[model samples]
Target: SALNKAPGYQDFPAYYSDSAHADDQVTHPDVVVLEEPWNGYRYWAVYTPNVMRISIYENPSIVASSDGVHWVEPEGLSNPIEPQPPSTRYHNCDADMVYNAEYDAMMAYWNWADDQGGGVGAEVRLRISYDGVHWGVPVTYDEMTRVWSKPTSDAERQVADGEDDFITAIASPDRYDMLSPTIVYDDFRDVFILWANNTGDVGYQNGQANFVEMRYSDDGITWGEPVRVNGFLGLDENGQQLAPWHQDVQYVPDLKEFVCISQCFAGRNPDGSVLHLTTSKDGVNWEQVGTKPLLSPGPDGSWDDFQIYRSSFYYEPGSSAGDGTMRVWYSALQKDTNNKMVADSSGNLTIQAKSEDDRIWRIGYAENSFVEMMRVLLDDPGYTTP
Candidate 1:
């Protein structure tokens, strides 16, 4: 049985279009729960909308909920927290945010990309807010110098130079660019660690395996050089290396370990990707938790039957590290009017009859008790099936 779906648990599609614009196809969910409710809601989420294979005028949108499931755009905040990109060709997306009690503020980070550039050249941008509603002006990167600019306000800059801040690096033509950046504050190490998938002009296959970089900083501002590590380490049932696409990582203070949940390349029906779990002690070397997938596509005709794309999770702070609870919101594409299967002469089946215009995506929710998750990780050495 899959570990995420529990007895009497609710079905997927926890946050969807009804709460936002009709054309919205929500995905890339990154959520944080406040210790003390902010604006009467403890759960805050930032995500992109209508992002099929590529984003269409999508920017990071914010929503909050008293209960983790039902989400709403807060009353006084603008829907897209950041301004629109310079042109329709540039996309602002793949956002992630973290709340810091030390500063009593939330730091949000995302990508600003020119899809037509040689390698879809991009920069990571950021904004900070105290209430999770009102935010500072967004900050961009200086590609020429390869450093992020200071926040618009001196106050914000002071905080960033001291504690909470953002992430990004400007990409040059035909070179590696940072994509889907995930940040974690390591209390144990007293530093901020950021991990991003490194991609190039050769197409997104770089995301398949062994193309992630790790960077760290004592204060959020000045970061160390990116270090390539064996971020994904495991083999598939066919003895091929597990291919990682988009992923999320969190530090478990109780265990002094870093745990990651990633979507791996799985061919054919029942989807574009399948979910897997991996853990690390030094955050450099990692190994898959178990042989079986943590989660897979739904039943043949379900909403997520077509594909599971990028996903993110919120690991509750208390408990004995891996024994706690984790809440995940995943983005999925569905087989709809725009998609259908057909075979060419080779008898290989592929979807047809679609334009990005008609593609549909949805965000779904699942929760897993980390005890079972850790058991699955620690019990197996030779990769036993979950």
Candidate 2:
């Protein structure tokens, strides 16, 4: 099924659209709406007063919004609550937050890279909060023990486990990787975090590549070892395995499944590269849902005509029109002829697209009939379409 043929394609309006100046206004945008923009930024997380909360991330900080539009940054504590070795830096980024009705508090899992001179690289970290503001110390996991331990890099070191070795497998100077964390609470399995797994050799021609993987936790502290989820294993037609990069995955509570959007370098093509999607029912077993390019370089003389990268997708909570429908938000860029575009600062427009059937997605609201209707009713009354 194509995006246009989705079930709810007729409802929502194209709330906003732009393809001009590149400023941080909102370009490369990720969004989440709650009751308020808590901490001076709009993060990929959302929370209601008592019902549910969801978060998204791409590194740096979590931006919270009240209505999903305007956002604010939250207040952070002065020190790390969960004391660790002197080397660990407890900052937040590439995070995912979820409300644990069972625990009566908000639980968050994120990647905490040791940026101190040693260059420790990034690892997933967990924290809990009562009010979504001041956070607790992180609940760290050691890939060796496959359990929670003191946040010291030495305590849980592994000697040699080959491809299965999480620590030794990913430790390297050239491999400054691991970012864009996403998590979801499974009623049956607990919680899962899917993130970019960049390790091994670098450079496109090397063949040894980076991709997306999964780790799960039962209590939000200790996590299972990494499991490769992207389906591009075994060399491609060019005798090369496609590298999975800039990955993002989200679980639909309604559908009880996970969807991942990743950049797969399928070797050089005349039309540039392609971004693809994969789905999993249990986090470990992933199935390629679609191989067609979700986003690609526009035609030779068009905006976004050169390349697009770093994309994510999520369901907009509570905005469904009483029909069990949802909205997906992602970030991408439109490149100029020079093969590069100016980065948006904090006010530039970000590209947004919507999908109803999970197959075909449109660039903006103008392409959806329901969005047009809502626009006429809310923004322009007495409006009629030709």
Candidate 3:
């Protein structure tokens, strides 16, 4: 059934797979898509000093673009930094990056294969860079005492013995399959980070897939306790509640709420897979305004007929009124005839969705052509015309 497919062939052609025939040359969707506009520069550029930064998940190597539309893979896009830590091998792929305007640098975070199943556990790591070209060391969170600890070979040294310096119990041990991390400044609460904590330990059946957790910092160096925001009780059928894999949160200053979206895989409505969003008045205590699956697999035999997974949200400079105005950039798996897909060929697409009141949403997929999609999402006036 759901978990029967081979290691990479879970969702078939519709989803990305590592194996497939020639005609079955699986071509899924891009790991990430940007909505901002590229001025005259060859590479993408965002006004980070005054604007916000967003990234997506891509294999082989991660890329960055400024306007969110035109993307380019810089020289050091894949390399982490010098003096690789012992836990570096655990962090293989599926990561996210963000630019810190205040620091004029970019921060990258991802989940690594460490300490899981007892064999040299993997955890989350953070890298910092000033120009997005060079990277620094990674900071990992200790599970034993719940604090940010430096990576060391000694498991005992990594464990927090009751020190109250950094936030304790911020993450779940068995369920800390931390993946994507998104950060933003709270103005009032300083800097805040919301990430996926999938330890699968704090809920029914230990089924918390993409649990949402929040931690704040006054200087960006130290963090506080992590608070759970989504996947509190899990969802029932009818798509009425939350499911697993709720990740990728973005702050919309115009909307005055945190636009958090996630993938729902485990629930009564399986095939009806989609992305859902929730809003929070303050950084904490988020209220589910809408549970609409922004996108679902097309008919049984279409490009995006398999499933729509990770999504990234961006607010166009002028189009901030309603649906068809806000530019929502995301990645999906386009199944081939053999029902197989690949990661490299999977391109990113844009969508013009209605978000007038936050209570109702009307979303439509942009044209498949990347050039055309960029025109409609970044150049078009209302983003309504194809």
Compose the digit string of candidate 1's lDDT tens values, residues 1-386: 43565222112222223322234456777888777797678988888776454455476778888877777877777667775565567777678887765665677888777777554467766676765666653234343554445456645433222112334433434433566778888887789887777665543655453367888876454577888768465765566566656678888665567888887764322246787887898788988866767777766645566667677776675544335676777777656535444222122443243444244556777776666655554555343212
Q: What is the lDDT of every predicted structure here?
A: 0.63, 0.40, 0.39
RMSD, each candidate, Å? 7.7, 13.4, 13.0
lDDT of 3 by residue, 1-386 (tens): 10011111211121112221221111111222233321222222211100001011111123445544444545644322222234423323334555554443444554444433545444444544444444543234433543434434433222221112222112335534554455566765556565564544332234424466677765344567667764332343355565655356666655566656555555543234565545566756665433334445555534445565555555443443322234444444443333232222232222211111111111123313222332332334334332
- TM-score for each candidate, following the candidate numbering: 0.77, 0.53, 0.58
Candidate 1 has an lDDT of 0.63
Model 2 regions more than 4 Å off: 1-59, 74-93, 104-119, 136-179, 191-195, 201-208, 230-242, 268-274, 297-306, 316-326, 334-386
Sort the predicted structures by TM-score, highest score first.
Answer: 1, 3, 2
Residue 347, model 3: lDDT of: 29
Query: Which stretches of candidate 3 lie above 4 Å from their native place?
Result: 1-60, 75-94, 138-172, 175-177, 201-210, 230-239, 266-272, 319-324, 334-386
Candidate 2 lDDT tens digits, 1-386: 11221111111121122232111222122333333333343343421110001011122223454444344444543222222223324332344455555444455554554554455554655555544554553235445564544334532321221212222212234323554456566666556454555543342333235566666667555556666664633333355555664555666555567766555666542124445556677776776543344445445533333444444455443344422223434333333312232222222333222221111111211112333323322344443322
